[PDB]
Amino acid sequence: PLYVIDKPITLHILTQLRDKYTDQINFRKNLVRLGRILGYEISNTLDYEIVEVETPLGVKTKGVDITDLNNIVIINILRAAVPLVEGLLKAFPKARQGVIGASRVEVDGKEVPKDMDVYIYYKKIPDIRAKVDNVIIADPMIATASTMLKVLEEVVKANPKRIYIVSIISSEYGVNKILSKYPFIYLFTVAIDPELNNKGYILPGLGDAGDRAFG
Amino acid sequence: PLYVIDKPITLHILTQLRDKYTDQINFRKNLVRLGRILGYEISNTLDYEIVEVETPLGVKTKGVDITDLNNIVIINILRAAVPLVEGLLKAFPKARQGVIGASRVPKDMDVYIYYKKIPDIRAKVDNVIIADPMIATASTMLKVLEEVVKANPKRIYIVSIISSEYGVNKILSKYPFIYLFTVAIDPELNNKGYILPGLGDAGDRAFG
Amino acid sequence: PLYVIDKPITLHILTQLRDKYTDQINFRKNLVRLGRILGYEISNTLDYEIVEVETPLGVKTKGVDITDLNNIVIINILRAAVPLVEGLLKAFPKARQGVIGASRVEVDGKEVPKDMDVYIYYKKIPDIRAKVDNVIIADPMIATASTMLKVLEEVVKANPKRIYIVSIISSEYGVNKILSKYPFIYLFTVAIDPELNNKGYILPGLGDAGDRAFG
Amino acid sequence: PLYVIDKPITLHILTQLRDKYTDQINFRKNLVRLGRILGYEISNTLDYEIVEVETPLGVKTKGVDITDLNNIVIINILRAAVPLVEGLLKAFPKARQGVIGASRVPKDMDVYIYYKKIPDIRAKVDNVIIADPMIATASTMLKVLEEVVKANPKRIYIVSIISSEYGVNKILSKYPFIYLFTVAIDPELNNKGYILPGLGDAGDRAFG
């Protein structure tokens, strides 16, 4: 399933992120804001039970309990995802965190990259509980989807209850590549850009998310 | 306009607020969360302008700019709105904030403003957001609105967690242009003016 | 006792607060920072116990437990103390909060005010456990100390274990008025300004803290 | 110089980190807290200039400006420094941040840098802060310093939570000019290279 969260405020924030004049401090501030917002949107898609609660007025009434808020594992793809994850963690205070350091092998060919070698320089992920945990993989940008696909090949083996992918900008090619292979993944993004340049960067995109956030 | 924000997560949070076992620390924590969420929902109803920005890729593309974010006045109705406003202020950093308290001296008992300190409201420009976690008889909200409507702001938003059917109808019938945001609308008020099922006295729940 | 927290970074932050050109957003941001810092400094004065803790290496070693982190009541003096309290709550996540709305009856040029009438328009304070709770009264500015004295009159009756007063700027007069009457109160401040003008404002001070933060 | 920040609150937080029962959520929360605290302590060792500011009362008074806050490069040694650096970056919002990882293959087994992405360090101007919650044999820290010192930064700070007596001496004997901040200095290391009593493998404690 594809969830494009393109409401006025999210597009307003995204505009700030795209703007090449937005410095690191403000870029991070806006990315955290989007992490909170996407966490909110994701929360509204989680399973939930109807419960009964007693108010101070001695009366009982129906309520809602999203039990899955207790079963979340967020995978932080360094370096770029750090601010996004900080925002997501605000939405899921009980989420355990896992980290994956990923970097693409740069390219500059005569044609637009379809695939790219991704080397994982660091990996520490908590035990994912099959059929129980909801895994949220966070990475601001999805271009060729090579990074996400490499992370997914491992996550899918854990057989989580559900897999969410949270990005800010995904390319049409990337979204297609992910959902066509894993059609049951919940892919959240704010905008879907049409293309990539010869270097594998998203156009219009926002540049290298890592550098935009931390220089 | 009535905006009942009853999404799974807001209903989950409301459940924690209603729960008598939720202590003040957790009660306030949830009120802050709702302030942020309602601020987000409100932000999506504001006017916006299409702008152009250039990305680091040296390409220009269309963007969005909600200029209204620069013109906001948040009014904290004294009782248990401090946490709600904390959240709203995170949603609207450029907002100026004021406080106002009303007290008495299925209910139309007259209330009066005992204290008020609200920043200058710019007519036809400012979007005023009035926060109060609970709207029961609506006497308090109506009294505050009487004051606010005089400033002739561009828009008036009301942010509440639980509003009574009675209060919702009374407010929106008198001021149909107001944007009333609430998480739930409870059916009745007891003899003492409490919302049933409600969540008790918000002041006691937050600072008691 | 008096604790003047005037380290380079707090003075740097205070400089931003004093600057008339610092907007509401940055004034609040810096006040929150001072709340965190003052919370940190206050924490280092709390009673604590030496405990034993087992590390993953299968060995036990000495540790510290500031049990009183669980026994704190923070009194938020509206409307100016809000951001300060926000920061303090970061240092004391288990603190219960109480609120007091206070507003001084304004006075014109006649004689530098020695005391003033303080109107308490709102009050909701949690139960303070005598001899157990540590009460922290937060208010960015202490000028004539009229506001603080009015709040203390009630707080002292609860006979808390200890009373802390946290301000950003206090006047020499205010500090004297508080400690001379309540010598056992722990008064924390970043700077002590020499005087008050004819309207009871601290000089050089930073203006009306409420307006500086919220307009 | 050696700066052991062993105040009641840091020792309290350290105790929670050492506690084998503290889960990763709370372990990371406490690391962020120490990042902020150590950032505060580091901030107080920086140079500052005297400036004048005008208050709303229309008078000018002396103020302080820590210009060094504009020139900071934070290096995250890969293992469990993410939460630590999160706190440090809150302390130094203008800081640029990089990452670096070193691996192998009472101990001197050599390490090598397998990955590094660090922003440009301005010689004689930048204050570089290298973060790693644990300093055991110090092989990793020394390996990282090899490259950093080449940038000739104005100052080099090291931010750790627990450092071994061996590592503290080794680093500061080789680089006497480095500002090493740590919360505690533990006496020994075991065959595997763990600090005793320490707190275990920080990476597992934070993300395991």
Ligand SMILES: O=c1ccn([C@@H]2O[C@H](COP(=O)(O)O)[C@@H](O)[C@H]2O)c(=O)[nH]1
């Ligand atoms: O315009 C772009 C394209 C890619 N990336 C980085 O590349 C990774 C994904 O690219 P890909 O593997 O989807 O091609 C992400 O971790 C992200 O940091 C960017 O930062 N900006």
Ligand SMILES: O=c1ccn([C@@H]2O[C@H](COP(=O)(O)O)[C@@H](O)[C@H]2O)c(=O)[nH]1
């Ligand atoms: O169940 C209730 C009903 C009302 N109120 C509070 O009592 C005041 C009176 O509201 P109203 O009856 O004027 O609507 C308001 O501050 C409101 O938040 C509560 O805390 N809980």
Ligand SMILES: O=c1ccn([C@@H]2O[C@H](COP(=O)(O)O)[C@@H](O)[C@H]2O)c(=O)[nH]1
């Ligand atoms: O320069 C000043 C002097 C006083 N106050 C306000 O007055 C109260 C304290 O003044 P006093 O009662 O100590 O005279 C505080 O709540 C504070 O908001 C200011 O904001 N700025």
Ligand SMILES: O=c1ccn([C@@H]2O[C@H](COP(=O)(O)O)[C@@H](O)[C@H]2O)c(=O)[nH]1
């Ligand atoms: O008890 C220990 C000892 C070391 N390390 C980690 O192992 C690596 C090796 O440190 P060193 O032996 O090179 O000092 C570093 O990333 C350090 O954080 C731990 O997590 N726990």
